[PDB]
Design a protein around this ligand. Structure first.
Ligand SMILES: [Mg+2]
Ligand SMILES: [Mg+2]
Ligand SMILES: [Mg+2]
Ligand SMILES: [Mg+2]
Ligand SMILES: [Mg+2]
Ligand SMILES: [Mg+2]
Ligand SMILES: [Mg+2]
Ligand SMILES: [Mg+2]
Ligand SMILES: [Mg+2]
Ligand SMILES: [Mg+2]
Ligand SMILES: [Mg+2]
Ligand SMILES: [Mg+2]
Ligand SMILES: [Mg+2]
Ligand SMILES: [Mg+2]
Ligand SMILES: [Mg+2]
Ligand SMILES: [Mg+2]
Ligand SMILES: [Mg+2]
Ligand SMILES: [Mg+2]
Ligand SMILES: [Mg+2]
Ligand SMILES: [Mg+2]
Ligand SMILES: [Mg+2]
Ligand SMILES: [Mg+2]
Ligand SMILES: [Mg+2]
Ligand SMILES: [Mg+2]
Ligand SMILES: [Mg+2]
Ligand SMILES: [Mg+2]
Ligand SMILES: [Mg+2]
Ligand SMILES: [Mg+2]
Ligand SMILES: [Mg+2]
Ligand SMILES: [Mg+2]
Ligand SMILES: [Mg+2]
Ligand SMILES: [Mg+2]
Ligand SMILES: [Mg+2]
Ligand SMILES: [Mg+2]
Ligand SMILES: [Mg+2]
Ligand SMILES: [Mg+2]
Ligand SMILES: [Mg+2]
Ligand SMILES: [Mg+2]
Ligand SMILES: [Mg+2]
Ligand SMILES: [Mg+2]
Ligand SMILES: [Mg+2]
Ligand SMILES: [Mg+2]
Ligand SMILES: [Mg+2]
Ligand SMILES: [Mg+2]
Ligand SMILES: [Mg+2]
Ligand SMILES: [Mg+2]
Ligand SMILES: [Mg+2]
Ligand SMILES: [Mg+2]
Ligand SMILES: [Mg+2]
Ligand SMILES: [Mg+2]
Ligand SMILES: [Mg+2]
Ligand SMILES: [Mg+2]
Ligand SMILES: [Mg+2]
Ligand SMILES: [Mg+2]
Ligand SMILES: [Mg+2]
Ligand SMILES: [Mg+2]
Ligand SMILES: [Mg+2]
Ligand SMILES: [Mg+2]
Ligand SMILES: [Mg+2]
Ligand SMILES: [Mg+2]
Ligand SMILES: [Mg+2]
Ligand SMILES: [Mg+2]
Ligand SMILES: [Mg+2]
Ligand SMILES: [Mg+2]
Ligand SMILES: [Mg+2]
Ligand SMILES: [Mg+2]
Ligand SMILES: [Mg+2]
Ligand SMILES: [Mg+2]
Ligand SMILES: [Mg+2]
Ligand SMILES: [Mg+2]
Ligand SMILES: [Mg+2]
Ligand SMILES: [Mg+2]
Ligand SMILES: [Mg+2]
Ligand SMILES: [Mg+2]
Ligand SMILES: [Mg+2]
Ligand SMILES: [Mg+2]
Ligand SMILES: [Mg+2]
Ligand SMILES: [Mg+2]
Ligand SMILES: [Mg+2]
Ligand SMILES: [Mg+2]
Ligand SMILES: [Mg+2]
Ligand SMILES: [Mg+2]
Ligand SMILES: [Mg+2]
Ligand SMILES: [Mg+2]
Ligand SMILES: [Mg+2]
Ligand SMILES: [Mg+2]
Ligand SMILES: [Mg+2]
Ligand SMILES: [Mg+2]
Ligand SMILES: [Mg+2]
Ligand SMILES: [Mg+2]
Ligand SMILES: [Mg+2]
Ligand SMILES: [Mg+2]
Ligand SMILES: [Mg+2]
Ligand SMILES: [Mg+2]
Ligand SMILES: [Mg+2]
Ligand SMILES: [Mg+2]
Ligand SMILES: [Mg+2]
Ligand SMILES: [Mg+2]
Ligand SMILES: [Mg+2]
Ligand SMILES: [Mg+2]
Ligand SMILES: [Mg+2]
Ligand SMILES: [Mg+2]
Ligand SMILES: [Mg+2]
Ligand SMILES: [Mg+2]
Ligand SMILES: [Mg+2]
Ligand SMILES: [Mg+2]
Ligand SMILES: [Mg+2]
Ligand SMILES: [Mg+2]
Ligand SMILES: [Mg+2]
Ligand SMILES: [Mg+2]
Ligand SMILES: [Mg+2]
Ligand SMILES: [Mg+2]
Ligand SMILES: [Mg+2]
Ligand SMILES: [Mg+2]
Ligand SMILES: [Mg+2]
Ligand SMILES: [Mg+2]
Ligand SMILES: [Mg+2]
Ligand SMILES: [Mg+2]
Ligand SMILES: [Mg+2]
Ligand SMILES: [Mg+2]
Ligand SMILES: [Mg+2]
Ligand SMILES: [Mg+2]
Ligand SMILES: [Mg+2]
Ligand SMILES: [Mg+2]
Ligand SMILES: [Mg+2]
Ligand SMILES: [Mg+2]
Ligand SMILES: [Mg+2]
Ligand SMILES: [Mg+2]
Ligand SMILES: [Mg+2]
Ligand SMILES: [Mg+2]
Ligand SMILES: [Mg+2]
Ligand SMILES: [Mg+2]
Ligand SMILES: [Mg+2]
Ligand SMILES: [Mg+2]
Ligand SMILES: [Mg+2]
Ligand SMILES: [Mg+2]
Ligand SMILES: [Mg+2]
Ligand SMILES: [Mg+2]
Ligand SMILES: [Mg+2]
Ligand SMILES: [Mg+2]
Ligand SMILES: [Mg+2]
Ligand SMILES: [Mg+2]
Ligand SMILES: [Mg+2]
Ligand SMILES: [Mg+2]
Ligand SMILES: [Mg+2]
Ligand SMILES: [Mg+2]
Ligand SMILES: [Mg+2]
Ligand SMILES: [Mg+2]
Ligand SMILES: [Mg+2]
Ligand SMILES: [Mg+2]
Ligand SMILES: [Mg+2]
Ligand SMILES: [Mg+2]
Ligand SMILES: [Mg+2]
Ligand SMILES: [Mg+2]
Ligand SMILES: [Mg+2]
Ligand SMILES: [Mg+2]
Ligand SMILES: [Mg+2]
Ligand SMILES: [Mg+2]
Ligand SMILES: [Mg+2]
Ligand SMILES: [Mg+2]
Ligand SMILES: [Mg+2]
Ligand SMILES: [Mg+2]
Ligand SMILES: [Mg+2]
Ligand SMILES: [Mg+2]
Ligand SMILES: [Mg+2]
Ligand SMILES: [Mg+2]
Ligand SMILES: [Mg+2]
Ligand SMILES: [Mg+2]
Ligand SMILES: [Mg+2]
Lengths: 202, 146, 100, 63
RNA sequence: UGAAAUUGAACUGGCCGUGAAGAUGCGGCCUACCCGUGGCAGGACGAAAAGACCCCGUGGAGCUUUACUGCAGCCUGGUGU
RNA sequence: GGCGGUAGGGGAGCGUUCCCGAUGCCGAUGAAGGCCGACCCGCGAGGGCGGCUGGAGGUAAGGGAAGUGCGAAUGCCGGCA
RNA sequence: GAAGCUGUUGGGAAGCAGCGCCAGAGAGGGUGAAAGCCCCGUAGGCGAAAGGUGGGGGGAUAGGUGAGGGUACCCGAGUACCCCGUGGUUCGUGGAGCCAUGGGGGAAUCUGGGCGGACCACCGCCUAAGGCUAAGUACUCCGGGUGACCGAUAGCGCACCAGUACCGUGAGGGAAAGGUGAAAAGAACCCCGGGAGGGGAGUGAAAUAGAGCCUGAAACCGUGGGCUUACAAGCAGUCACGGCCCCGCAAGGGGUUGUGGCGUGCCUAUUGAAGCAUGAGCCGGCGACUCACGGUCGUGGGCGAGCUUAAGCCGUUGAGGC
RNA sequence: CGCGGGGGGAACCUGGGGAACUGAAACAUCUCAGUACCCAGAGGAGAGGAAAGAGAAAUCGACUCCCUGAGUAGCGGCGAG
């Protein structure tokens, strides 16, 4: 929806948004798949009847032998022989329409916001990469750890903080991906990062 | 919203048919049962039969080739004035190519149906009927030359 | 190379199983099989002996190898992890928060 | 990879703007000698071709 | 001491029918306790061999020749040497 | 009220291997698998429960990708008759 | 290279409980079983006397840079060009050019000479018959990283001392074969026995973990028991009745079969099979409709007179965007 | 007397030579294909490379490689390709 709870050193001023409302699960899904799809690296290999050390000679004359009938041992029906239709390496990715890419990211952030978890932040007293600081901030922020958080900030020091913290996941502003988003319970991002987010979709 | 329950909205269904099992599609494995069904048939579209294929037709299409290849002639992209009037201002090959119906084409020819709005239509070609609508309200910018 | 591990031949506590808590000085440490011999795991060998030379070999329940993961270095304070402080000229090792 | 347009077919048949297939009337060149004015005329124009049209389409596809 | 080919599973009888037209196995009827050792070779369309005969496949191969086409080789005009 | 059925087409589902679910959850008070069952649920393929073996793994709900279920191929490898 | 200690279950904790801690490290591996803090690592960070690599940074050297007029000296020869025979090209003789050249004729030096698909004109292009040239590209014997890659009939042929054993004159062909247990504590002594092997004792949580030993299925061989059978005729079962034996208080259920009823195996192939047509000894494991590109119809979703990006680039290290 | 060569290298590369099966539902042009293979040579690459080019734009401006152009132009017993 709209109105989002922005947190600052000056209190909890709740600004407004523009994100849509109608959350279409299927669409959201397609995107997520596309993600878990493009990362799928093809490495599974099975040397077919072709690439097998075995000779090319015929085992029996296939006549007046009393035996079955074959050529070389490279035949699949020769335990050890070439795989029949074994999967060879190949890409699993494609090109999901850009519109959808954004449409999802919108409905995504909009969903967790609509539920009431999109806490925009700014005041980061976490002077450096010292986890203690972060957990001390999150504590006074409303993040007792009972909810997995996606931390989107520009500062690389804030990374350090929740970087090791198990119940949280750091991420770049552009790193906004529909997977990790709909992969956590809470979403909390830097106001400045909410700006670049408004760039892709505002 | 959590990972669980995002799946296809009931209509993806990767229900790939398994042609061999014991029920549904068994021994023969999918529609077969006869012979010449193991490697592959002829084409068959356009091709087999054994006789003089339906390829009995005859090429009237002249200019059906030449050694030097293809001649270089001004390609004329026919554009309808109905879409032309949609946007108003100064319609030139520049505008129609940037967004419209030109696609790095060569020549532009306004014509067709619709009701030409009052504006300068800088085209390379004009239909006799197309020269009427725009002459009832507007100007007729012809092409270049050199 | 790199085989080097925790302690050596000194004062050690056993936090393993059948001899948990027990303390003892480690007399042997076999890097290959990554194990140390203290005074803990001491099982009985019935065997007379593999080499006929010297009649009686012993029904000895002698010291047995023990994984060098369950033994721990120690000092005045009982049971501490290892830290290394390059001295003023050499390379010595300090325990948790004390010397050597 | 990439269907290859059956040139032979294209050089002798062009597809309509709708979903039909058209070709020149057959038997007008060789056999000719003195066939009624009707013949040579009826053989001048073109025609539709029913089922096999669906086949020929499956050739000049990228076309 | 210790094989073999073979082997759907067997609780594996005769006759007259019968059946894809030559039944231990289906009908009717007649015989007929269970198990084996030695011997014969009529049946199990006995075993072995995806019939050598025959036909079919726009299969394969060797061979012939005034089948086609082509090559070596030989004859020959011009020509360079 | 329809519901014999081969070639066929169409529909629904079961199980197998891996993936997200997982920094989770089940698990030595016993994992996977093996053995038994006259119990339970399902039309079914299967699923569940109980005893026994076994000794360290296993993996819901909801989704995703396949080297995905064998009785035969004088099929292949092995073991035994 | 930060951070753990007590108790409890157990043969054994890392499980379970109590209180605490680090975290630029909660990747993974191990430790007697399921450990951020016990061990090896991880994040981050430090390092070379010798060798190799090394314009990325710097310096130096080689080489090279101007106008107008006249002269027209020079500008790649058995070459161009032409013809005969051919190769390359999309070009199969075709209106056949261009590039190359086997045979023959055989030239000029900018008023030169090739070319823009026969050929001519016109217009424009380009300087043949000497040579050199980084990068972007190919590959993977080799080292590393990762896997909706295999997990010993898989995966390389080979996890194991394998291109071995073995087969072939030879070229060449080419296997099978992994696992005790946390620890070897791998069984002292006694008993029978020539030995192998067992039996008792001792080890272990466990010895139907005792040594090609984890799990240990099937075919297959065997011992004990219950039921059954020597007047019987059969695709071996199925329906009923009865008797025997076995679980339950009962009703009931299970195992077995005496008698009666009914009854032509499976697969394939066929007009048609139990067929005296095919295939199968038996078991267990291996085994056959896929993948890429393009097309087509259906379908879910986005967007709509528009829809969509390709290579690649920036980013990351299982983030996307341009 | 000095400088160099010889030979080996999984794959990759240029050059010299170069099939047939197969397809055309026969087959001989055509196809497979400059593929397989042989031989020589090079190197971490090779090849190629500054125009006697391209081609219709009084346009580009070495070579190489990717996408595209395009299954287009065109080639073809105008068959298969
Ligand atoms: Mg091969
Ligand atoms: Mg081979
Ligand atoms: Mg070999
Ligand atoms: Mg072969
Ligand atoms: Mg071979
Ligand atoms: Mg072969
Ligand atoms: Mg061969
Ligand atoms: Mg035969
Ligand atoms: Mg294999
Ligand atoms: Mg193999
Ligand atoms: Mg294999
Ligand atoms: Mg793909
Ligand atoms: Mg696909
Ligand atoms: Mg696609
Ligand atoms: Mg994290
Ligand atoms: Mg919701
Ligand atoms: Mg719907
Ligand atoms: Mg059916
Ligand atoms: Mg079958
Ligand atoms: Mg068949
Ligand atoms: Mg037939
Ligand atoms: Mg075939
Ligand atoms: Mg014209
Ligand atoms: Mg013109
Ligand atoms: Mg309109
Ligand atoms: Mg203890
Ligand atoms: Mg006629
Ligand atoms: Mg006329
Ligand atoms: Mg037989
Ligand atoms: Mg048989
Ligand atoms: Mg009888
Ligand atoms: Mg009878
Ligand atoms: Mg006797
Ligand atoms: Mg006898
Ligand atoms: Mg005899
Ligand atoms: Mg006989
Ligand atoms: Mg035959
Ligand atoms: Mg023939
Ligand atoms: Mg022949
Ligand atoms: Mg000759
Ligand atoms: Mg029915
Ligand atoms: Mg019916
Ligand atoms: Mg069917
Ligand atoms: Mg299903
Ligand atoms: Mg959940
Ligand atoms: Mg994980
Ligand atoms: Mg499993
Ligand atoms: Mg189980
Ligand atoms: Mg069941
Ligand atoms: Mg249970
Ligand atoms: Mg047990
Ligand atoms: Mg169990
Ligand atoms: Mg899983
Ligand atoms: Mg398979
Ligand atoms: Mg079957
Ligand atoms: Mg079999
Ligand atoms: Mg046989
Ligand atoms: Mg056999
Ligand atoms: Mg066998
Ligand atoms: Mg260290
Ligand atoms: Mg440490
Ligand atoms: Mg305390
Ligand atoms: Mg737990
Ligand atoms: Mg130095
Ligand atoms: Mg050096
Ligand atoms: Mg450099
Ligand atoms: Mg300097
Ligand atoms: Mg200088
Ligand atoms: Mg100088
Ligand atoms: Mg100088
Ligand atoms: Mg100067
Ligand atoms: Mg100058
Ligand atoms: Mg002069
Ligand atoms: Mg010159
Ligand atoms: Mg010369
Ligand atoms: Mg000269
Ligand atoms: Mg010329
Ligand atoms: Mg010319
Ligand atoms: Mg010449
Ligand atoms: Mg002469
Ligand atoms: Mg001169
Ligand atoms: Mg030119
Ligand atoms: Mg010319
Ligand atoms: Mg011309
Ligand atoms: Mg002139
Ligand atoms: Mg030159
Ligand atoms: Mg590359
Ligand atoms: Mg490696
Ligand atoms: Mg490697
Ligand atoms: Mg696996
Ligand atoms: Mg596994
Ligand atoms: Mg193997
Ligand atoms: Mg041992
Ligand atoms: Mg003993
Ligand atoms: Mg013994
Ligand atoms: Mg003994
Ligand atoms: Mg003994
Ligand atoms: Mg024993
Ligand atoms: Mg057991
Ligand atoms: Mg055991
Ligand atoms: Mg034993
Ligand atoms: Mg041993
Ligand atoms: Mg043994
Ligand atoms: Mg065993
Ligand atoms: Mg084991
Ligand atoms: Mg074990
Ligand atoms: Mg057993
Ligand atoms: Mg055994
Ligand atoms: Mg017995
Ligand atoms: Mg008995
Ligand atoms: Mg018995
Ligand atoms: Mg009687
Ligand atoms: Mg009786
Ligand atoms: Mg009877
Ligand atoms: Mg009783
Ligand atoms: Mg009782
Ligand atoms: Mg009772
Ligand atoms: Mg009763
Ligand atoms: Mg009873
Ligand atoms: Mg009863
Ligand atoms: Mg009963
Ligand atoms: Mg029983
Ligand atoms: Mg009967
Ligand atoms: Mg047959
Ligand atoms: Mg027949
Ligand atoms: Mg039939
Ligand atoms: Mg029979
Ligand atoms: Mg039979
Ligand atoms: Mg027969
Ligand atoms: Mg037959
Ligand atoms: Mg047989
Ligand atoms: Mg046999
Ligand atoms: Mg056999
Ligand atoms: Mg057999
Ligand atoms: Mg089996
Ligand atoms: Mg089998
Ligand atoms: Mg399979
Ligand atoms: Mg399969
Ligand atoms: Mg497709
Ligand atoms: Mg169509
Ligand atoms: Mg469609
Ligand atoms: Mg579609
Ligand atoms: Mg729709
Ligand atoms: Mg649609
Ligand atoms: Mg709809
Ligand atoms: Mg739609
Ligand atoms: Mg819609
Ligand atoms: Mg990460
Ligand atoms: Mg992973
Ligand atoms: Mg000298
Ligand atoms: Mg030398
Ligand atoms: Mg050499
Ligand atoms: Mg060399
Ligand atoms: Mg090569
Ligand atoms: Mg070559
Ligand atoms: Mg052919
Ligand atoms: Mg023939
Ligand atoms: Mg041929
Ligand atoms: Mg040929
Ligand atoms: Mg060719
Ligand atoms: Mg060549
Ligand atoms: Mg060549
Ligand atoms: Mg060489
Ligand atoms: Mg080069
Ligand atoms: Mg060169
Ligand atoms: Mg041109
Ligand atoms: Mg590239
Ligand atoms: Mg291309
Ligand atoms: Mg023809």
């Amino acid at each position: 929806m709209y109105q989002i709870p922005v947190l600052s050193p000056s209190g909890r001023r709740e600004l407004a948004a523009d994100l849509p409302a109608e959350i279409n699960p299927h669409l959201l899904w397609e995107v997520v798949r596309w993600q878990l799809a493009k990362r799928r690296r093809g490495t599974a290999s099975t040397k077919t009847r072709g690439e097998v050390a075995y000779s090319g000679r015929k085992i029996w004359p296939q006549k007046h032998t009393g035996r079955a009938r074959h050529g070389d041992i490279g035949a699949p029906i020769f335990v050890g022989g070439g795989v029949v239709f074994g999967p060879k390496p190949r890409d699993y990715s494609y090109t999901l329409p850009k519109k959808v890419r954004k449409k999802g990211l919108a409905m995504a952030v909009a969903d967790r916001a609509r539920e009431g978890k999109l806490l925009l932040v700014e005041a980061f007293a976490g002077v450096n990469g010292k986890t203690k600081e972060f957990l001390a901030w999150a504590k006074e922020a409303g993040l007792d750890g009972s909810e997995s958080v996606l931390l989107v900030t520009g500062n690389e020091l804030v990374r350090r903080a929740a970087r090791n913290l198990p119940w949280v996941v750091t991420l770049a502003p552009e790193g906004l991906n529909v997977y990790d988003i709909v992969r956590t319970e809470r979403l909390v991002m830097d106001l400045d990062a909410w700006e670049v987010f408004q760039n892709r979709i505002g | 919203d959590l990972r669980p329950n995002p799946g296809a909205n009931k209509r993806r269904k990767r229900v790939g048919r398994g042609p061999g099992s014991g029920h549904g599609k068994t021994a023969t494995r999918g529609h077969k049962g006869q012979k010449s069904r193991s490697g592959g048939l002829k084409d068959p579209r356009r091709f087999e039969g054994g006789r003089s294929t339906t390829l009995m037709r005859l090429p009237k299409r002249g200019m059906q080739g030449q050694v030097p290849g293809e001649i270089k002639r001004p390609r004329y992209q026919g554009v309808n004035l109905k879409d032309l009037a949609r946007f108003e201002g100064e319609v030139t090959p520049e505008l129609l190519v940037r967004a419209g119906l030109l696609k790095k084409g060569y020549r532009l020819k306004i014509l067709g149906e619709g009701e030409a709005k009052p504006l300068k239509v800088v085209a390379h070609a004009f239909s006799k009927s197309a020269l009427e609508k725009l002459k009832a309200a507007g100007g007729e910018p012809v092409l270049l030359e050199a | 190379r790199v085989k080097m591990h925790v302690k050596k031949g000194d004062t050690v506590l056993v936090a393993s199983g059948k001899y948990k808590g027990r303390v003892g000085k480690v007399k042997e440490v076999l890097p290959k099989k990554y194990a140390v011999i203290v005074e803990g795991v001491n099982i009985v060998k019935k065997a007379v002996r593999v080499s006929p030379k010297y009649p009686q070999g012993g029904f000895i329940e002698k010291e047995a190898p023990l994984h060098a993961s369950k033994v721990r270095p120690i000092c005045p304070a009982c049971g501490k992890p290892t830290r290394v402080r390059k001295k003023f000229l050499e390379n010595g090792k300090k325990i948790r928060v004390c010397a050597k | 990879p990439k269907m290859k347009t059956h040139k032979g077919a294209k050089k002798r048949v062009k597809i309509t703007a709708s979903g039909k297939v058209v070709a020149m009337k057959t038997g007008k060149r060789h056999l000719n000698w003195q066939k009624s004015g009707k013949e040579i005329r009826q053989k001048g124009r073109k025609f539709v071709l029913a089922k096999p049209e669906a086949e020929r389409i499956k050739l000049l596809l990228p076309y």
